[PDB]
Amino acid sequence: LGGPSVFLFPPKPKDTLMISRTPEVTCVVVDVSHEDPEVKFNWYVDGVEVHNAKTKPREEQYNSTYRVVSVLTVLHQDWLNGKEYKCKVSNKALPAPIEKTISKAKGQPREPQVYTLPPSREEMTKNQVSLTCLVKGFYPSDIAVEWESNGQPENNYKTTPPVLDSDGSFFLYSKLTVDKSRWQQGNVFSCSVMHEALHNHYTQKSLSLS
């Protein structure tokens, strides 16, 4: 090999769900000499040239080398429908242009099932309490889960990364903590789940005592 390198990035998962968010696949080119800093980007969607579709570039200097960045905004549907996004970078010091395609995970998706699992008496000794919320049978792994406690974004709550199941789907927990008192003296919460399934790529499940 030897020459400029090219990396293609996809859009942020959450950006691809909230239509109010602007997705964008990014095509970075590194190892751009100071001798031939000319970088020609050509983008292609499902085979045809997107031309501009409003694609944007411009260069900067790091090591002692150059880095250019063209960026194509991805149309939600398109992206979600599995359209393939190709980026063709071609430098002068490049014997033949480099093509990089990226695309949303292939295969039919699956509606993530959410279940709130209250803490265990055995742990009702300690001062804090392990609230939990597993989500399983969803596909793909593109998911985010927060915790609305009082119309707020609670602090100390850890979530695990999805793990492949036997089906083909994935699952993941989300132990949310809270001082005993809180839950103790009867309070409520809910985990937020976002997948490319749910009515509006959104669903929430509540969990309190009783």
Partner: protein, 167 residues
Amino acid sequence: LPKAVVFLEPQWYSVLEKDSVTLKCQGAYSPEDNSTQWFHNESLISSQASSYFIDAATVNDSGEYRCQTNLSTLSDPVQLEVHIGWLLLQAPRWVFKEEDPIHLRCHSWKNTALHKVTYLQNGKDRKYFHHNSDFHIPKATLKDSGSYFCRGLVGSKNVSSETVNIT
């Protein structure tokens, strides 16, 4: 009687192992029996070759090399510095100052293919290269007082050269 003179081929005084070096003992010999004497650190070695050939350079082949003959006083000495590595920064001399383009070669063990090579001075990247290539300098300048060392990509793994002081 004149002194024999030892020359190097290639002209690189510092080299990597596996590298090939050749010490030649130029000069005149006696018409009656003309053998050459080689001296590693003022000591002998299989005495003959008008050109002692160091085929597979290793660390030990390092030291002062001198040569003599049936009609020459002990040659002046020549230093051969042999190191272990993937890369090596070469140059005839590091003590530079004026009117002389600083020639810096980044050499790779067994001469493997080196790419996306950088030349550094004080842990700072001074020059990038897509494919390995020597690092010269237009007009010598007092602003070249530092510590250099190159590194790059042998295949897909990184390699570096021991540092040096371009004085």
